[PDB]
Amino acid sequence: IHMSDPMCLIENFNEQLKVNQEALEILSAITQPVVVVAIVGLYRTGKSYLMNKLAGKNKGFSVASTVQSHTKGIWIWCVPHPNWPNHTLVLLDTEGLGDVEKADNKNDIQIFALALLLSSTFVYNTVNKIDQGAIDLLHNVTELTDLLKARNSPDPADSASFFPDLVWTLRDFCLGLEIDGQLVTPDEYLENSLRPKQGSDQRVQNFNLPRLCIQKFFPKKKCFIFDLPAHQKKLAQLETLPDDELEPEFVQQVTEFCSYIFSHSMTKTLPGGIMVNGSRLKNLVLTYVNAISSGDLPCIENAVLALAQRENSAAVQKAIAHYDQQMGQKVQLPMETLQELLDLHATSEREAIEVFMKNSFKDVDQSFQKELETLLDAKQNDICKRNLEASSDYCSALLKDIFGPLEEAVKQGIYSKPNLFIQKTEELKAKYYREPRKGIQAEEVLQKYLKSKESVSHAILQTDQALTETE
């Protein structure tokens, strides 16, 4: 019915997640509702030892005392609940985080996430003190867990209502529980560490981001302290010593921790008022392991690579900002020649690339440099086409200020007398040609106008011939 000894539930075979069918079969045979308690923390912090206490046994989850990690994967121990009749207590012992020999550092987050998803009570095991790194890791994995859970979902309860209750344990605790001159309980110490700072300013955003998350996903928190259990020369073989050879405060602290778990941990639930049993827990194991194996848990690349990308992206923005202010050398969009525009773009592009290199950091494959290159190319066509229509629009304005009076004169009839229209057009064409600061479009605008008015010239000549005969 229940398990005399724990078994491995989830293995890391090679570097894939593998479920143990023997443990699944035993688990799915559990017909009672299950209270699931999981422990997670850095490796070599006495997690397996503490979990054996919850089972009320002296041995169980394997314990070791070298610098090397010991527990691998996630282990399962289904035992009768010692206090709640007709309930099964489900204990989950986990591979510790931060193993400096483990190549698959991302598997840490997978085990962390699985512990949050499978448990109803989550025991976060830390040493000496609350560290910001422990807070940020809980923050990061909680967000990744909620995202994965949303990618595997189909009324009013939010996803956060199904996260487990948080139990924060402090091992080898020695520092004074005193904050700003006031003595505090372990719970008040936890609250002070997790309390968002008041206000809305930028000075507070980063501090409050993980705490707003933990406040949201873990409303019910509990903190426990544990003294050093014995002299350090006796920590190896600790599980061999009877309670009267350990520190009395530690023995009582372990008892108070176990009593809280037995009295406050709840049956795991699922959306729709469903009480989880062994079979439904097996479905949760298979569901989430497959979701992780198919990529539903996001993966963040190493922080040095992410920071390099942020700095290179900033470097490209400073590069185009320096090429945009350097185009003040162009004192005129109607430039005289087109090659002077191209040369000024080249010197500005060349200067902007230097400021990019100055502000860049490990731009692998020049991927961010090539991006800047295609941006500056777009800046070339953008200035070459705005140059064209700056020449046209200015030249067209001169055609209506030099030739405007002649158009009115011809419309009146001044040149209906008995070829002196052509003579004055040529002198006004040279007038137009002498106007400084006309772009490269000058000849085109003028010739297009002369062809527009080449049909009026013929008619004026015709009329001149007709009137010559009359007298």
Distance CA 354, CA 117 (A): 50
Amino acid in the structure at residue 450:
L
User: Among residues 70 and 211, whose Cβ is nearest to Mg ion?
Assistant: 70
Q: Restricting to residues 13-52, name those near Mg ion by CB under 5 A.
A: 48
Q: Which of 18, 57, 70, 216 binds Mg ion (CB under 5 A)?
A: 70
- Cα four-point dihedral sign 226, 229, 231, 234: negative
* Residue 43 marked ligand-binding: yes
* Residue 318 marked ligand-binding: no
User: Among residues 39 and 148, whose Cβ is nearest to its own copies?
Assistant: 148
User: Among residues 7 and 235, whose Cβ is nearest to its own copies?
Assistant: 235
The H-assigned helical ranges of 294-336 are 303-325
Instruction: Map tokens 């700056």 to a residue.
Output: 390
DSSP per-residue string spanning 364-431: GGGHHHHHHHHHHHHHHHHHHHHHHHHHHHHHHHHHHHHSHHHHHHHHHTTT----HHHHHHHHHHHH
User: Among residues 95 and 146, whose Cβ is nearest to ligand GDP?
Assistant: 95
Q: What is the binding site for ligand GDP (CB under 6 A)?
A: 43-49, 63-65, 70-71, 96, 171-172, 174, 226, 228-229, 235-236, 238
Least distance to Mg ion from the beta carbon of 70, Å? 4
In the bound state, the residue with its beta carbon closest to ligand GDP is 46
Among its own copies, ligand GDP, Mg ion, none, partner that 393 touches (CB below 5 to 8 angstroms by kind)? none
If binding is defined by CB under 5 A, does position 72 make contact with Mg ion? no
Least distance to ligand GDP from the beta carbon of 88, Å? 23
Q: How far is CA 361 from the centre of its chain?
A: 20
Least distance to ligand GDP from the beta carbon of 247, Å? 10
Least distance to ligand GDP from the beta carbon of 373, Å? 49
User: Among residues 22 and 131, whose Cβ is nearest to its own copies?
Assistant: 131
* Residue 44 marked ligand-binding: yes
User: Among residues 10 and 63, whose Cβ is nearest to ligand GDP?
Assistant: 63
Long-range contacts of range 254-261, CB-CB < 8 Å, 24 or more positions apart? Answer: 254/50, 254/53, 254/226, 256/224, 257/50, 257/53, 257/167, 257/169, 257/224, 257/226, 258/53, 258/54, 258/56, 260/167, 260/222, 260/224, 261/37, 261/54, 261/121, 261/167
* Residue 28 marked ligand-binding: no
Angle between helices 442-452 and 367-402 in degrees, nearest 10: 40
Among Mg ion, ligand GDP, its own copies, none, partner that 229 touches (CB below 5 to 8 angstroms by kind)? ligand GDP
* Residue 42 marked ligand-binding: yes
List, comma-separated, the residues after which the chain is broken, a break being a C to N distance over 2.5 A; otherwise answer none.
Answer: 154, 418
What residues form the annotated binding site? 41-48, 63-65, 171-172, 235
- Can you give the binding site for Mg ion, defined by CB under 5 A? 48, 70-71
